[PDB]
Amino acid sequence: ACYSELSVQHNLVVQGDFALTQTQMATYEHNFNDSSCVSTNTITPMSPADIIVGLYNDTIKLNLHFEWTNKNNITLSNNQTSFTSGYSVTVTPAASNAKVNVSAGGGGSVMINGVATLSSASSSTRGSAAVQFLLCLLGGKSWDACVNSYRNALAQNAGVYSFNLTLSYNP
Ligand SMILES: [Mg+2]
Numbered sequence: 001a002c003y004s005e006l007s008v009q010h011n012l013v014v015q016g017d018f019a020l021t022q023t024q025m026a027t028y029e030h031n032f033n034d035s036s037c038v039s040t041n042t043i044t045p046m047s048p049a050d051i052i053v054g055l056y057n058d059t060i061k062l063n064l065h066f067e068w069t070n071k072n073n074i075t076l077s078n079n080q081t082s083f084t085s086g087y088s089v090t091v092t093p094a095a096s097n098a099k100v101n102v103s104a105g106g107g108g109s110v111m112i113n114g115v116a117t118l119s120s121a122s123s124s125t126r127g128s129a130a131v132q133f134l135l136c137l138l139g140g141k142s143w144d145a146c147v148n149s150y151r152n153a154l155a156q157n158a159g160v161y162s163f164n165l166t167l168s169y170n171p
Pocket of ligand 1: 006
């Protein structure tokens with residue numbers, strides 16, 4: 001079993017000429033150490049969802065697409081506590097008509113919690129949390145509201161390891 005709720009924060013700076021290129025990719029890694037992990041544990045990379053980010057009074061809408069660098073489960077041997085994970089994110093323009101999941105208000109930067117999450121929990125805990133999360137998004141709720149419930153469900157009796165992303169775009 002593992003039990004800790006761990007997170008890392010990364011920054012994504014959108015290029016000043018994104019209006020031309022209209023695509024950008026970033027890649028992040030992080031080594032987590034959960035000192036509570038005992039026995040053998042399987043850490044599952046949770047399938048991510050695209051995020052629609054709204055900037056400057058939601059006049060600039062961006063689509064963030066996330067892909068795990070290693071899509072395989074992480075296997076921790078007996079009392080092994082540390083593991084490396086990461087993901088790549090691709091930034092593209094969202095349709096003019098897209099619903100914003102995360103809004104910067106009047107500014108050009110947003111903090112996005114839980115863009116990518118791994119869990120040590122069972123398939124039952126993971127699937128319930130993941131499904132409620134996606135239904136929450138489909139029901140039109142904000143990313144932060146949904147992700148907080150999602151991380152909270154995963155963190156109850158298991159380890160949850162989250163990537164947070166700050167996105168900024170200042171052309
Ligand atoms: Mg730590």
